[PDB]
């Protein structure tokens, strides 16, 4: 359940709906759902938060269950709805949010350098990126010619 990583503390036990086919007391068409998604990605919100607002407002807990089957290759869900349109960021949001944050740290340290702890999370966030990079290369969202560095983090954000 847990993983105490850079911690000793058991992780949240947040858990999914054990629903495997979707509510029908809730009702939306493949067309209506697709609109809602596109509207929200147009705002500047991102896929986790897109799935969040749809849940809280339109009452759809996860997209996969509602959508698929409509092309049963795999489950149809937010960003796989986005890529077919061309609205997808070529960097996975995972890797993006990560790097995004990271560049902010550096600026703090820039002005403030006497910071143990703040220094120590720079080291703790990079090394999650590294990993997240490493595997993607092999999966293929990021070319094999790339390698990660703090000038090649300040170029991707700008």
């Amino acid at each position: 359940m847990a993983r105490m990583h850079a911690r000793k503390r058991g992780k949240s036990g947040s858990k999914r709906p054990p629903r495997t086919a979707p509510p029908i007391w809730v009702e939306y068409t493949v067309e209506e759902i697709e609109n809602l998604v596109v509207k929200l990605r147009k705002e500047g919100y991102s896929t986790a938060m897109i799935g969040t607002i749809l849940r809280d407002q339109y009452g759809i807990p996860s997209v996969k269950l509602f959508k698929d089957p409509d092309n049963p290759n795999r489950n149809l869900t937010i960003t796989r709805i986005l890529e077919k349109h061309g609205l997808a960021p070529e960097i996975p949001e995972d890797l993006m949010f990560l790097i995004r944050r990271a560049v902010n740290l550096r600026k703090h340290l820039e002005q403030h350098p006497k910071d143990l702890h703040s220094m120590r999370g720079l080291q703790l966030i990079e090394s999650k990126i590294r990993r997240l990079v490493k595997y993607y290369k092999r999966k293929g969202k990021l070319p094999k010619n790339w390698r990660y560095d703090p000038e090649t983090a300040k170029l991707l954000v700008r």
Binding site: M1, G13, K15, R16, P17, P18, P23, W25, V26, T52, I53, R55, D56, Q57, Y58, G59, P61
Partner: protein
């Protein structure tokens, strides 16, 4: 909980009927965020801990 005897969240669904426009919205008993009415611009619920605290009197049918 019931993690080895099938974990099911605490959740449910409830039909909320707006008091300012009569607009019928489906709402997750736990609002994580501010849910906005789609034909008033109002706030139905506000996100605090556990179950979103419902702002004032808004009608409710419990599913």
């Amino acid at each position: 909980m019931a993690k080895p005897i099938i974990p099911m969240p605490r959740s449910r669904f409830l039909r909320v009927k707006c008091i300012d426009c009569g607009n019928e919205q489906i709402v997750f008993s736990h609002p994580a965020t501010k849910v906005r009415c789609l034909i008033c611009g109002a706030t139905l619920v506000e996100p605090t801990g556990g179950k979103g605290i419902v702002k004032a009197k808004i009608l409710e049918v419990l599913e």
